[PDB]
Amino acid sequence: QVQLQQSDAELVKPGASVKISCKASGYIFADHAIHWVKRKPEQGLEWIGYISPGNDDIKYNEKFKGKATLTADKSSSTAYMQLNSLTSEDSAVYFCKRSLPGTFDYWGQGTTLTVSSAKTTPPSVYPLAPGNSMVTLGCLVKGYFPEPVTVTWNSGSLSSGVHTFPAVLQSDLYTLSSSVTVPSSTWPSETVTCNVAHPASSTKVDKKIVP
Amino acid sequence: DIVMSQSPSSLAVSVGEKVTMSCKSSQSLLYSSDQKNYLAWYQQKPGQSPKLLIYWASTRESGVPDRFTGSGSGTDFTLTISSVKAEDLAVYYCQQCYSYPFTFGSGTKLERKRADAAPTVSIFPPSSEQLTSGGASVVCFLNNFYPKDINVKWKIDGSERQNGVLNSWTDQDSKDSTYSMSSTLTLTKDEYERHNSYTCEATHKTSTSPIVKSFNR
Amino acid sequence: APGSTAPPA
Ligand SMILES: *[C@H]1O[C@H](CO)[C@H](O)[C@H](O)[C@H]1NC(C)=O
Ligand SMILES: *[C@H]1O[C@H](CO)[C@H](O)[C@H](O)[C@H]1NC(C)=O
Secondary structure: OOEEEEOOOEEEOOOOOEEEEEEEEOOOHHHOOEEEEEEOOOOOEEEEEEEEOOOOEEEEOHHHEOOEEEEEEHHHOEEEEEEOOOOHHHOEEEEEEEOOOOOOOEEOOOEEEEEOOOOOEOOEEEEEOOOOOEEEEEEEEEEEEOOOOEEEEHHHOOOOOEEEOOOEEEOOEEEEEEEEEEEHHHOOOOOOEEEEEEHHHOEEEEEEOOO | OOOEEEEOOEEEEOOOOOEEEEEEEOOOOEEOOOOEEOEEEEEEOOOOOOEEEEEOOOEEOOOOOOOEEEEEEOOEEEEEEOOOOHHHOOEEEEEEOOOOOOEEOOOEEEEEOOOOEOOEEEEEOOOHHHHHOOEEEEEEEEEEEEOOOOEEEEEEOOEEEOOOEEEEEOOOOOOOOOEEEEEEEEEEHHHHHOOOEEEEEEEOOOOOOOEEEEEEO | OOOOOOOOO
């Protein structure tokens, strides 16, 4: 019944502004303040401020005064947060949430903000073959932007002993590797393929692992 | 500003056993007019919104299981899970609600205890394709070990190498509760071709001596 | 205010 529906993920350049929305339904919008909370990897949760649309009361964390603007449109039951002069420090998940901790506590689904100078870039995929009863192979997935990518092995049918590692950032571009472990008998006598998909560029790479 | 402190940063818990988590405030959160502590506990699981578990230090929010209990007063607070379940492996944050600005602790992540397991280590030369385009990434996988603490050391021609090494750690595996790690040494083709011997060494509590994997180009 | 909900301090 009660919902806080946030706007879609945002990807922007450093120095840009963004305005995130939070649409309330299933209750009377004016009855509860909307607080904004930043969830940034390795920086837990941080309170930004609130707007109380019923009495037009707005309060900011001092750190965000001059950086964030909170508004509300009562006619559309929507709260907004604008962030200006964006840097990579602003990359995070932003939540709107209702009221104080207690009975009315309720959260939006979150909006991801990525701030980067990089251009959308498909991955280059490089096969990893070795220089035991089991053998490990891999793929190196280099130079893509933005997240995410998905990696499968033989189209998902090689499901076991797969590890796809969190990407690391290098020159504004992401790189990761994926490993798969198969029986020695099956490789190289059978073909092993890593299948990389990058939704943002609509790209699929199928790279065969050659001994 | 009230400073909230949580320890430990993460905790390996035995499923089915009790866990206790601590939170400390730099200032008392006890309001003398109503005798309530303005302290809340939140759970967050990856890709999900925070969920309120506890407010006023000890009041359980609606739809929160009875195995969750908040206690304490003033500056010293505790969240207890009796008989922790796999679904409770998550990050727990305390938040003071006593004054603006609202401030949270840095969180306690619950991970699952299991038996110790040595890593499976494997090293990979750069692909001829990568070399043709002028690059040389040498990749080492340290797969399916427990516990999560591990040290990797690269050696080029017997000599320890620190620069150009990028490491990446998986979150705990949801099936077997192990950890994995990738260590990538990134060189230019020319740098790579100046040396002959590449070694990845992993030290883990499961052995006194390192697991050593190498190749010669 | 104490009327409208807010933190106590
Ligand atoms: C306090 O709680 C009431 C509902 O009981 C409203 O949600 C009000 O907006 C809350 N105040 C703040 C500052 O969020
Ligand atoms: C009432 O005022 C307080 C400030 O004292 C907060 O703005 C709160 O959000 C308001 N409550 C409602 C329901 O608008």
